[PDB]
C-alpha cells in the first residue's frame, strides 16, 4: 500500500523525461496506475493512466507526446518528449487509483523542471532582527536562500528544535531565472544573545548544506 | 472532449458552520465521480469515489451527491483543519478521448476567524550579501486574515513598481492566519543612491495604511 515516484530533475527542453512509479505493498495487476501533475501554485492536471486491464487512457493533450508502459515486477513508467520549458515544470504524482473499489494512496510527488539553465547552489543571507524587527516582546529573524536552481530546498531551524513560529514561504523564481526563498521565525527577544539560532539548509540538487548562524545587529 | 467545471473558486464558512462545492460534466459520467483534499504541501487525498461513497476513516460530515451532470460535496462541523483546496475528477475514461480523468479547476475551503491585522518587520541587506553586489530588503507581514494585502515599497518616496517579489503561505491549520514575504532587490550601487527604504501596507484590519522604513545606516 504505498507507491513511489523516481527519476526527476533538471531536463534540458530538448530532453526527454521518463519518470518511474515502483510499487511495494500490492499486486500490482488489477489496479490501475494515474499520473497526475501539478504545475506550482497551480490545480492538478491528469496525463494518463494504465488500467489493471493492461489497457492504456491519455489526456487529449498528452496522447501524442507520451507513453505509459508497466513492467510488472513493480514498476510503471512515464515518457515524454517534446519538452516545454513552460508548461511541463511542474510536481509528477502516482497514483494507484480504483474507480470502485476503496484502494487510492498518493506518493509524495518529485520535481520536474525544463530549462536550458543549469544547477546552482543557494546562497544564505541572515535576516538579523533588530528594533526594526521586534515588537516589545517578539523579535523576528530569518534566512534569506538566494539564487538556486532548480527547485527545491529545505530549511530548518536548529536542527528541527524550532518549529512553531517557522514560516517557510513558497520560492519565487525571480527576472534572473534563478529561485528565492525567505524563512522566518518569531523568537521572544529576551532570548536574542543567550540563545543561539541557526539555519539549516539543503538543497540535494547541488549536493550543499549550509547552517548560517542569525545573530542580533 | 470532457471538461470538469467546479463552482465556486472560493468559499468561506466559520467553524462548526456547512460549505457546499458544486461540480459539473460535459456529458454524463455516471456516478464515476470523486472528491480529493489538498492540504498545503501534501500529495491529494480521495474523500469520496463513485460519487457518493466515502473513503475509509473519512468523517461522514462530507457528503457528496450527484449523478449524470451534477455532483455536490457539502462539508459539515467545519474544523480549522479542512481549510484545504477540493477536487472533483471524473473517474471514467475511454481511448477515444471522449472521457478522462479530467479534475475541476479546484475549490479553496477558508476558515472564517475574525479580522487581524499583519505585524509588519523589516530587515535591511546583510553586509555579506552587499559583498557580492545585491541588495535585498524584506518586508514580512505575520499573522493575519483574511489574506487580501498590498504592500508598496517606497524608495526616497517613489514608488517601486516592478522590481517586487511578494509570496504567502496558505491559511494556517491552528491559527487561520496567513503571512506575506515581500522583497525589494537592487543592486549594490543602486541601493546606495538612497537612503528612505520604507514598505506600506494595507489590509482590511488597519484603518490607514502603515509604514515601516529605515535609513540606509
Ligand atoms: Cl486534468
Known amino acids: 500500500q504505498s507507491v513511489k515516484e523516481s527519476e526527476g530533475g533538471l531536463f534540458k527542453p530538448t530532453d526527454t523525461l521518463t519518470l518511474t512509479c515502483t510499487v511495494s505493498?500490492?499486486?500490482?495487476?488489477?489496479?490501475?496506475i494515474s499520473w497526475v501533475r501539478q504545475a506550482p501554485g497551480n490545480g492538478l492536471e491528469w496525463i494518463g493512466t494504465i488500467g489493471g486491464s493492461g489497457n492504456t487512457y491519455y489526456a487529449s493533450w498528452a496522447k501524442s507526446r507520451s507513453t505509459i508502459t508497466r513492467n510488472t515486477n513493480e514498476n510503471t513508467v512515464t515518457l515524454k518528449m517534446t519538452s516545454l520549458t513552460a508548461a511541463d515544470t511542474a510536481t509528477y504524482f502516482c497514483?494507484?487509483?480504483?474507480?470502485?473499489?476503496?484502494?487510492?494512496?498518493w506518493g509524495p510527488g518529485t520535481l520536474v523542471t525544463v530549462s536550458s539553465a543549469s544547477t546552482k547552489g543557494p546562497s544564505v543571507f541572515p535576516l538579523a532582527p533588530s528594533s526594526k524587527s521586534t515588537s516589545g516582546g517578539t523579535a523576528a529573524l530569518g534566512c534569506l536562500v538566494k539564487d538556486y536552481f532548480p527547485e527545491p530546498v529545505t530549511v530548518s531551524w536548529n536542527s528541527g528544535a524550532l518549529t512553531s513560529g517557522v514560516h517557510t514561504f513558497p520560492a519565487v523564481l525571480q527576472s534572473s531565472g534563478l529561485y528565492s526563498l525567505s524563512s522566518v521565525v518569531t523568537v521572544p527577544s529576551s532570548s536574542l544573545g543567550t540563545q543561539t539560532y541557526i539555519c539549516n539548509v539543503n538543497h540535494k540538487p547541488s549536493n550543499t548544506k549550509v547552517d548560517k548562524k542569525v545573530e542580533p545587529k | 472532449e470532457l471538461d470538469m467545471t467546479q463552482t465556486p473558486a472560493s468559499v468561506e464558512a466559520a467553524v462548526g458552520g456547512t460549505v457546499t462545492i458544486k461540480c459539473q460534466a460535459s456529458?454524463?459520467?455516471?456516478?464515476?465521480l470523486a472528491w480529493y483534499q489538498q492540504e498545503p504541501g501534501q500529495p491529494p487525498k480521495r474523500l469520496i469515489y463513485?460519487?457518493?461513497t466515502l473513503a475509509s476513516g473519512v468523517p461522514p460530515r462530507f457528503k457528496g451527491s450527484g449523478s449524470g451532470t451534477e455532483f455536490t460535496l457539502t462539508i459539515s462541523d467545519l474544523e480549522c483543519a479542512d481549510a484545504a483546496t477540493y477536487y472533483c475528477q471524473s473517474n471514467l475514461y475511454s481511448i477515444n478521448s471522449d472521457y478522462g480523468a479530467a479534475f475541476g479547476g479546484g475549490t479553496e475551503v477558508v476558515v472564517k476567524r475574525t479580522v487581524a491585522a499583519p505585524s509588519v518587520f523589516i530587515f535591511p541587506p546583510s553586509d555579506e550579501q552587499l559583498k557580492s553586489g545585491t541588495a535585498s530588503v524584506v518586508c514580512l507581514l505575520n499573522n493575519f486574515y483574511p489574506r487580501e494585502a498590498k504592500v508598496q515599497w517606497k524608495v526616497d518616496n517613489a514608488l517601486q513598481s516592478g522590481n517586487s517579489q511578494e509570496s504567502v503561505t496558505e491559511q494556517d491549520s491552528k491559527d487561520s492566519t496567513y503571512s506575506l514575504s515581500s522583497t525589494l532587490t537592487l543592486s549594490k550601487a543602486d541601493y546606495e543612491k538612497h537612503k528612505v527604504y520604507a514598505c506600506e501596507v494595507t489590509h482590511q484590519g488597519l484603518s490607514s495604511p502603515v509604514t515601516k522604513s529605515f535609513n540606509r545606516g
Open positions: 505493498g500490492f499486486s500490482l495487476s488489477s489496479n490501475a
Open positions: 456529458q454524463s459520467i455516471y456516478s464515476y
Open positions: 463513485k460519487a457518493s
Open positions: 497514483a494507484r487509483d480504483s474507480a470502485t473499489t476503496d484502494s487510492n494512496i
